């Protein structure tokens, strides 16, 4: 029996369109704290954790706790309909339905059925959103995978194919590395198909945190508004 209102609806569609890109279905836990989504792609190689806390909503009226499951494709398509300055209202009554309304020149409400639900990091790097979006796209031109290498005071992503090779160095001098913290030399490789979905839509002004371990999974983290967060856990190669 909840009523949840988010300003900047196009923004809200974006976050969900990320989460839609790797998983086909998802659970939304609504609670008086906030909204949570936790989920793994079909092949259990990536894990998504979305936390959207009460503060980022203009109205947040939850009564207890329940768990919405939705067709993420049909949700993606409804949420894409929101304009940038329009208001998003999410609503749930007794009936198994999500009411989504967008308000602008006129208010439109869409009803969508509910469906059935269901680390010792060596290196930590902070990096602007553009740098990593660019490296992933650069690397895709030459290979299906990208290596991450962190020595003390210097951070490298590199990929190699048959003929061609790519490498992007950053030291603390480099303009889009905010921070690096590595205990020991750290080297790991990750598939580009997943990285592309993870970093698609990351502005110059977006601080992205990445924690990695020698041949172990990457944790990528960036914030939604101030309070909310998205974390991606990605299993590595070999």
């Amino acid at each position: 029996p909840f009523e949840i209102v988010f300003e900047g609806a196009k923004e809200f569609a974006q976050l969900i369109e990320t989460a839609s890109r790797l998983i086909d279905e998802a659970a939304f836990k609504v609670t008086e704290e906030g909204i949570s989504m936790r989920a793994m792609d079909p092949s259990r190689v990536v894990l998504i954790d979305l936390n959207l806390p009460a503060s980022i909503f203009s109205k947040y009226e939850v009564d207890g706790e329940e768990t919405i499951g939705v067709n993420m494709d049909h949700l993606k398509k409804v949420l894409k309909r929101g304009k940038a300055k329009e208001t998003l209202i999410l609503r749930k009554g007794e009936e198994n339905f999500l009411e989504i309304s967008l308000q602008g020149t006129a208010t439109r409400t869409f009803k969508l059925p509910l469906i059935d639900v269901e680390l010792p990091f060596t290196a930590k790097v902070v990096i602007l959103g553009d740098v990593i979006k660019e490296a992933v796209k650069d690397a895709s031109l030459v290979s299906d995978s990208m290596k991450f290498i962190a020595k003390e005071n210097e951070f490298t992503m590199r990929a190699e194919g048959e003929t061609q090779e790519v490498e992007v160095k950053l030291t603390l001098e480099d303009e889009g590395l905010l921070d690096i913290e590595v205990q020991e030399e750290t080297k790991s490789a990750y598939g580009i198909s997943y990285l592309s979905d993870m970093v698609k839509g990351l502005g110059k002004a977006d601080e992205v945190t990445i924690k990695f371990g020698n041949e172990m999974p990457m944790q990528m983290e960036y914030y939604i508004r101030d309070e909310g967060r998205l974390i991606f856990l990605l299993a590595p190669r070999v």
Partner: peptide
């Protein structure tokens, strides 16, 4: 090259 699963971590 060898893509493993998250389950083993």
């Amino acid at each position: 090259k060898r893509v493993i699963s998250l389950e083993e971590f």
